[PDB]
Design a protein around this ligand. Structure first.
Ligand code: CL
Ligand code: CL
Ligand code: CL
Ligand code: CL
Ligand code: CL
Ligand code: MN
Ligand code: MN
Ligand code: MN
Ligand code: MN
Ligand code: MN
Ligand code: MN
Ligand code: MN
Ligand code: MN
Ligand code: MN
Ligand code: MN
Ligand code: MN
Ligand code: MN
Lengths: 81, 98, 95, 106, 99, 85, 92, 103
DNA sequence: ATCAATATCCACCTGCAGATTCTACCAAAAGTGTATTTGGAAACTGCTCCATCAAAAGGCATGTTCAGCTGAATTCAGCTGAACATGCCTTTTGATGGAGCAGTTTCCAAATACACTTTTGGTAGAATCTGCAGGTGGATATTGAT
DNA sequence: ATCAATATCCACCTGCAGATTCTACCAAAAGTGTATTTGGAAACTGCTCCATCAAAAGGCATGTTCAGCTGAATTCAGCTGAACATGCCTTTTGATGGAGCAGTTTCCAAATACACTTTTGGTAGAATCTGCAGGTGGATATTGAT
């Protein structure tokens, strides 16, 4: 028994915050962060798969992700941009 | 016996994670999540290793950025603790929830 | 003496279909015209790029369709995809 | 005689003109026959969706001519159109009436 | 004996009023001067279509009315009901204009 | 032949800045707001007029068109409907 | 199937002759050139249309550059751009 | 070759072919690929020089993404040019808001 | 801050594996040399649309008074979130095979680009038509003092 | 729990500025008929990708103790909102000269289309190099206590 969003754990969520310069963290932050992360992932993956489906493929490619991220307005360098 | 006062290790960790570039989410839990979510849009999908890697890069950059604006918002309310109302406020002004 | 063209008469036709006793001010019609020109360009550009990623010279109604799914929020997409699919089959079944 | 492609597709929007704009717009070398039809359809659907919601806005405020205020009310009060046009400014459209709760008297 | 509304009451009336209308809220001629002034400090001997000045004003007012919404949220977040420059600065710093 | 333009940002009056705040639903306004608002407005306008004029000159013209402003506003990511957009 | 790599490394060597570059870094640089390439080409593409012209000339490229690049980076880019064009014309 | 004719390392011929085959316009001027290639190379040098300095500052001789990130964000202008761009494996600038430091 | 004792951090050296550099060769861009096109810069000019000017009048900006209620400063007790040691388990990772399926190739049928050649649908003003803006004057609602 | 001072509302009226309808030309769809591609549909392969497997190694989950931070409660000086008098200057209405869009023509400099001819940039095995990750051993920072 376990859920996958919950696999995004507290230690890890604490680390991202720390890179962002966060010093003290309300205990409610963690479930909020999983919510936000899930919308971010859905929005991007949905677009990526739309690229896959258009390319008549059964495999999400790094370019499908890069193109998705680009039209979401989050351009990524380093993976074939 | 010895122990650091609260806030001190927190600052050490900040200096640490701001100095490095490693991914901060464990690879496999994240990979599950990605596949899990993908499966609701098309079934029996496969992923290039790089496709999962780009996604993680994108997410961690996004979230690290979001915590920056969130932390600004907490400080604006004369606090040093981020709270969901801070994240909500940052997302509305970024226009993600407006 | 020079020829400006617009989506007006079509916007007005559709207007009359939907609210048969309602008019439209010229400034409102201008805005509508700017909306059709915008959306046309958004869809066409995404289509242009999809055609490229697949090493194709041609924009097929299929390209327009993927572009539509990408550009439009989900329920608005589904009805648009349907209307598009429907008008195309209706077209092919003729000469 | 000659039958227009619009009528052949069941459309008010001008299929021929949309075909011309596609070739002449540097979008691709060549353009397939169905693409201007599928695109003219989508444009007409969306136009119709905004005009239906705007007409209701005109009627809710007892006017029979749609003005920019009415376009704005339709677009912001509808969550999907709102997002579609979330970074668009509508000249002479104003804003939605909205006063934060915290600001009202006891 | 004289009559007067308690402070805050007229403010609320004005909110309901200006949210009900669409007219421009900056005076036409002063705004035109500002434009001509700024343009000219960038290129001399420029002329303007009337609609070009009207387009600029429309854009500027829509931008400012939008900026005060985000500002007002920032004040409220600080448990205040008075917008302050630090609120605008926070609004613009998110939002990417000062990041 | 010309008249000299200067200090025109002060033509954006306090009454006018107050109305814009009100359409934004703002109830109370600190006295420092008004000059801050002029700061933000002037940058907003310079940035748009600069790009518009780049469009004017590329068209080898001496007249800023409404279309120049619209194209300008568009690449800024502030698309405007209502003027031939 | 092709890349801007060899030019990046050429340019790297004029500027820091004793400095190397990781492959992951080389991608980023390649994604950067592609990006900017596409930004400038697109703005130039639109510029040509607004003027009802069929051709994208170095004039359209430069206006596109003044529009895309922040004020000091723009100036230098415009210089180098003008400089490569005259030097080129003055050959045979 | 046209690159050498322009004094350029960047491939003038290729930049032209990409322009034709990208549907930007019907025809392409002779000078546009030169002017654009010039522009791409300049920007490329600007970043590599700054990144080269970032490498040297940390006692390294090979530029990695961290160095490209340190370079871009610490420069006000490049930062603005790539203000909505994410650099894989670049990290963030060390920056701690004052109010969080101990008394 | 001194007086002291855990922990953290920073430096200098060092050996090694994983990447980076250096070498050795072929289809396909890139360059040439012709032979035509053709866009669009130059050169009149017909004609909107801008800059300016004048002149009168009220809507609105300015400037002042005055006091309500807001922001800021202080205080303080409870309870949330940090630090830290313990104990378990999920993630990492390393090869081993297998097959799913992206990435190329090879054909022809279907579809798209041309080139002229009739045939309408749209557009630009003229000729009408008709919401609604702006102004009253009266019932209804809101707010604030006693 | 009331009246008095205002603000807000909703209807009814009426001429006008702006929307809709009416007509006459031309740019541009549509129609046919050759002249070209191209997007797919089928058959194969090398390559990444999934599925496992199997230990070890950390990294996470748990619980305890207490620090210090957040939220509440009170206080008060002074800033900012409401109201008022004055009168500046914007808004409105109307013409006038002329700058400069914009509409047409005309015609070479520049670009595109073949046809070959060369050169380069990719790809797949060959050969040093740079950090990484560990090791001290020396100060540093942090925290508790005369
Ligand atoms: Cl060969
Ligand atoms: Cl011609
Ligand atoms: Cl009245
Ligand atoms: Cl003249
Ligand atoms: Cl070579
Ligand atoms: Mn000046
Ligand atoms: Mn050229
Ligand atoms: Mn061979
Ligand atoms: Mn006065
Ligand atoms: Mn007082
Ligand atoms: Mn009193
Ligand atoms: Mn208070
Ligand atoms: Mn005070
Ligand atoms: Mn099978
Ligand atoms: Mn007809
Ligand atoms: Mn009225
Ligand atoms: Mn205590």
């Amino acid at each position: 028994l376990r859920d996958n969003i919950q696999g995004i754990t507290k230690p890890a969520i604490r680390r991202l915050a720390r890179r962002g310069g966060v010093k003290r963290i309300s205990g409610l932050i963690y479930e909020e962060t999983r919510g936000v992360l899930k919308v971010f992932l859905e929005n991007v993956i949905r677009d990526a798969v739309t690229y896959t489906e258009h390319a008549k493929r059964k495999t999400v490619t790094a370019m499908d992700v890069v193109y998705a991220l680009k039209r979401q307005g989050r351009t990524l360098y380093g993976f074939g941009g | 016996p010895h122990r650091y006062r609260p806030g001190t290790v927190a600052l050490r960790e900040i200096r640490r994670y701001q100095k490095s570039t490693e991914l901060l989410i464990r690879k496999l839990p994240f990979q599950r999540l990605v596949r899990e979510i993908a499966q609701d849009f098309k079934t029996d999908l496969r992923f290039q290793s790089s496709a999962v890697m780009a996604l993680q890069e994108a997410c961690e950059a996004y979230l690290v950025g979001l915590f920056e604006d969130t932390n600004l918002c907490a400080i604006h309310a004369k606090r040093v603790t981020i709270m969901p109302k801070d994240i909500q406020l940052a997302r509305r002004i970024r226009g993600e929830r407006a | 003496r020079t020829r400006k063209e617009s989506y007006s008469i079509y916007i007005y036709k559709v207007l009359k279909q939907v609210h048969p006793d309602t008019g439209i001010s010229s400034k409102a019609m201008s805005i509508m015209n700017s909306f059709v020109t915008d959306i046309f360009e958004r869809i066409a550009s995404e289509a242009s790029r999809l055609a490229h990623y697949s090493k194709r010279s041609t924009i097929s109604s299929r390209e327009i369709q993927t572009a539509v799914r990408l550009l439009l929020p989900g329920e608005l997409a589904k009805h648009a995809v349907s209307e598009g699919t429907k008008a195309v089959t209706k077209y092919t079944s003729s000469k | 005689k000659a039958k227009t492609r619009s009528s052949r597709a069941g459309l008010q929007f001008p299929v021929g003109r949309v075909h011309r704009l596609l070739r002449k717009g540097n979008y691709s070398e060549r353009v397939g026959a169905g693409a201007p039809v599928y695109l003219a359809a989508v444009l007409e659907y969306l136009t119709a969706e905004i005009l239906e919601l705007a007409g209701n806005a005109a009627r809710d405020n007892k006017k029979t001519r749609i003005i920019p205020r009415h376009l704005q009310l339709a677009i912001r009060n509808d969550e999907e159109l709102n997002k579609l046009l979330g970074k668009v400014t509508i000249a002479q459209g104003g804003v939605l009436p909205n006063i934060q709760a915290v600001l009202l008297p006891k």
